[model samples]
Target: TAEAGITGTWYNQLGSTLIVTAGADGALTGTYESNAESSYVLTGRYDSAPATDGSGTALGWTVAWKNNYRNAHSASTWSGQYVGGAEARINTQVLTTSGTTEANAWKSTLVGHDTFTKVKP
Candidate 1:
């Protein structure tokens, strides 16, 4: 189910583009294009056939930033579910790390919600 439905191009509320490929074994690999003309590698998993029958697959992915000016040296994670309908969408919660050092790691985590809709072509 998810192996076919989850593999495609998706756009988030922030205009970030995600192009993903889902393997039969639930491995997910993709590329994330941020709104700011930056691209990063995304890797994650798809929990196919969830406990709830016909509900949808749980999805999770992480993007590790490379050396860049904005959001440098940080990792972002998105966890959500793929909902199918006339138009497929992945509704997710995002968490990103700002300061990874132990000194100021207390409040370095940022949280937000994003809905990614499938893009045709």
Candidate 2:
């Protein structure tokens, strides 16, 4: 699946950003720095893939951040698509795990996605 083209800085519609570093092994690493202006610095890795949402659009890539960190057993998936090469939408879900099953870890969980605009190289 080697298409990790969602590399570099992406800004949500609300203007928070995520910097993605990715390579050809389907590998992706992501984080938020201090100046990126977000309260959380999410550090995690996942394999990249073409979107599996039945549309099969070329740039509709997605990643499943399974067993993600801060050292808790948890997982998430981000489904993204580029719009006109300048903006994108990524649907997301944050989940907790019990052994291998994903469940909500909180009463009010992270349950939505963001539409991001590309802001950099």
Candidate 1: deviation at residue 70, Å?
Answer: 6.9
Q: Give me the candidate number with maximum lDDT.
A: 1
RMSD of each: 2.8, 7.1
Q: How many backbone clashes does candidate 2 have?
A: 0
Q: In candidate 1, what are the lDDT values of residues 1-121, reduced to their tens digit?
A: 7788889899987788999999898899978886444888899998866655668679899998862545576789999999876789999999998756798889889999989997633
Ten residues in sequence with the least summed lDDT for candidate 2: 59-68
- What TM-score does each of the candidates earn? 0.85, 0.48
* Model 2 C-alpha lDDT per residue in residues 6-108, reported as the tens digit of each score: 5677776566666776565544566643242223334444344555554322322332333223333333344544433324434343332233424533442
Provide the lDDT at 27 for model 1.
Answer: 91
lDDT of 1: 0.84
